[PDB]
Amino acid sequence: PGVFSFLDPLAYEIWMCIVFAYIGVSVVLFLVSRFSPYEFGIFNSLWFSLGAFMQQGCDISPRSLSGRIVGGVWWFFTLIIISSYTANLAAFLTVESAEDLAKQTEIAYGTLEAG
Amino acid sequence: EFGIFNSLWFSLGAFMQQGCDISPRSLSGRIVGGVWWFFTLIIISSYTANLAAFLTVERMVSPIESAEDLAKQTEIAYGTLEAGSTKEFFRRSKIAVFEKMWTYMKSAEPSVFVRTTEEGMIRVRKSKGKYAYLLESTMNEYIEQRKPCDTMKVGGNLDSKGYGIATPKGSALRGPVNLAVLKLSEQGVLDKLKSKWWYDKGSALSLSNVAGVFYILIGGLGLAMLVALIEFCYKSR
Amino acid sequence: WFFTLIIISSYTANLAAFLTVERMSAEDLAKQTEIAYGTLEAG
Amino acid sequence: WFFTLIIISSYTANLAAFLTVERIESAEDLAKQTEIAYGTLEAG
Amino acid sequence: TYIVTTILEDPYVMLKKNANQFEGNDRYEGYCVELAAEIAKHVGYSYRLEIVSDGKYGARDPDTKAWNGMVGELVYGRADVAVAPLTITLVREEVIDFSKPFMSLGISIMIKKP
Amino acid sequence: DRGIQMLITTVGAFAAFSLMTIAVGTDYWLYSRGVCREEVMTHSGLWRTCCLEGAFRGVCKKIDHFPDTAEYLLRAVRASSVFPILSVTLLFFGGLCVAASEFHRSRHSVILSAGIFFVSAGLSNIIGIIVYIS
């Protein structure tokens, strides 16, 4: 077993890039929402992006064309990643020789002396 | 509140199951949202379920390790060299697996057999995993040790035998050749020749699986920044 | 909400099993009885 | 929320494994397994 | 001079790179070439490496009962020795004599490694 | 706290540019077993892969990126390393605007363009990482 085995379905690289994408999405959503004609602060954007990625929603939503493009793609990225995690975990929960031991040399092999 | 812009936004939000700022209130509007919600539930569940089947049967595939167990058990069209000891071994076999293999090989069309070892080697290399040239372990090992090293020996040896120096029956060279082979074997000559001509020749989903959805997200972020600048110039003019 | 959560999960799980399963003789004819087998008469 | 997302995906993933896995024919089937014990009549 | 039948097979017997510059038994290289040289040295005879014409190792056609390839070349008298990777088999031992094996092997499966 | 706020921007803009321009120049991106010329532990980068031990330790060669337009475009992008280079170029332009903000306070667009450049540089850095991993 493993303590943090719940991260096994997705590789460590995917988890790192999800964090980077979440930081980038929040900064861009804060930027386009602030300098636009028509409460998306920097902190509100991080709360919205964390809720949007985790399928829990938020009390406030984007209202501008440029802001809604950021929310739309972030939602789509969320659906593919969350579905990928569930599908790969289901495969994991559903489902080796002497030649293997002879071919390698990392595991030391010996004999009896004077035999 | 349900203009053309918000209707597109509400529909997209409902399909991604991320909720929306407003919900339809009229009976006519709530019917459209109701079937769209049901449509989203069936499609997204279908996508997740099909991906699970896609990544299970991809696992649980199994290599072969002497698939001869079920012989070809598939389109790995296994063949042999024509007029060789291997073909004769399969023809005269009485072991269940080998008899099954022979009955398949003799009747299979087109002929699984080949005319030369090079022909079988190229047949496996150009069948892209569709041919298997049951051949002698020595040749198999020599080939697998040379480029284009895209071929590999699977499992153990089906039997044990050896090459001999032949002579016509009743030949006077029979005795001297036997003694010569014993001398060459005891002096390490055969070992050196073998070593010279054979040895001296010499899981989690990856980012590549979901790399497309990262390009879309960054491409979407860049487009939104360009759109924002356009509205800035349009509003300020 | 609890009824919805279990039912939606059941639908997705059973559909995954449904799609996975299909992705994966003379004695046989004699043992069964669902298929009828015959010959030519006076042959 | 994170505890919620991981657990529910675990429920769906494990239930799919439960429903799929669950789904004799020969001499080998008995010889090959060891969960079912098979015997004969004595002095027969 | 004895005629030693052989077959083209890497790396037992091979045509040397630019074999045109050479002629006769010296046109080839490989394990069996050096083995034939060493056997000839020990036995004390001269030999010419003739490649089998059929390009087949050897088999008795069940219909005609004719041996083809190297075994046929040996039985009918056209060759005096065979120094190819010729497997020792019961059917062949009934019609030609074999020395002690000079190499071990078995039937094996080859699959595209890709 | 505008004075401290501008101090953070000036310190960060130089720090971001220094960190990214060092990564592109250095060859310690990946620790993988390869051959510089027997397979031995090697440390690679965006341009050269170099052995960590062995007789040829310290001497190394240029990465051969090239040995279905999907693999052609990805390898051409990865070979040229334009995305990691673009992030450094964007950071350099973003750093220039921050410095010129004090020297020209009449226009307010100088410090907003700097904020846009750093965000664009960070986005290009994410793409360069994904292309490198792929």
Author numbering:
A (entry chain D): 508 to 545, 566 to 622, 630 to 649
B (entry chain A): 566 to 767, 781 to 815
C (entry chain B): 602 to 625, 631 to 649
D (entry chain C): 602 to 624, 629 to 649
E (entry chain A): 390 to 503
F (entry chain E): 5 to 41, 55 to 84, 92 to 158
Authors' text:
AMPA glutamate receptors (AMPARs) mediate rapid signalling throughout the brain, and orchestrate various forms of synaptic plasticity that underlie learning. These cation channels assemble in various combinations from four core subunits, GluA1–4, with each contributing unique gating kinetics, trafficking and subsynaptic localization.
Here we determine and characterize cryo-electron microscopy structures of the GluA1 homotetramer, fully occupied with TARPγ3 auxiliary subunits (GluA1/γ3). Second, the NTD dimers translate into a parallel configuration, where some classes adopt an ‘O-shape’ conformation, as described for heteromeric GluA2/3 and GluA2/4 NTDs. Interestingly, these transitions take place despite the presence of TARPs, whose extracellular loops remain associated with the LBDs, and accompany their motions. Together with a study implicating subtler GluA2 LBD rearrangements in desensitization, a complete rupture of the LBD dimer interface may lead to deeply desensitized states. Closer analysis of the three sets of desensitized structures reveals a gradual transition of the LBD tier into four-fold symmetry, which is greatest for GluA1 and smallest for the edited GluA2 mutant: GluA1 > GluA2(F231A)-Arg743 > GluA2(F231A)-Gly743.
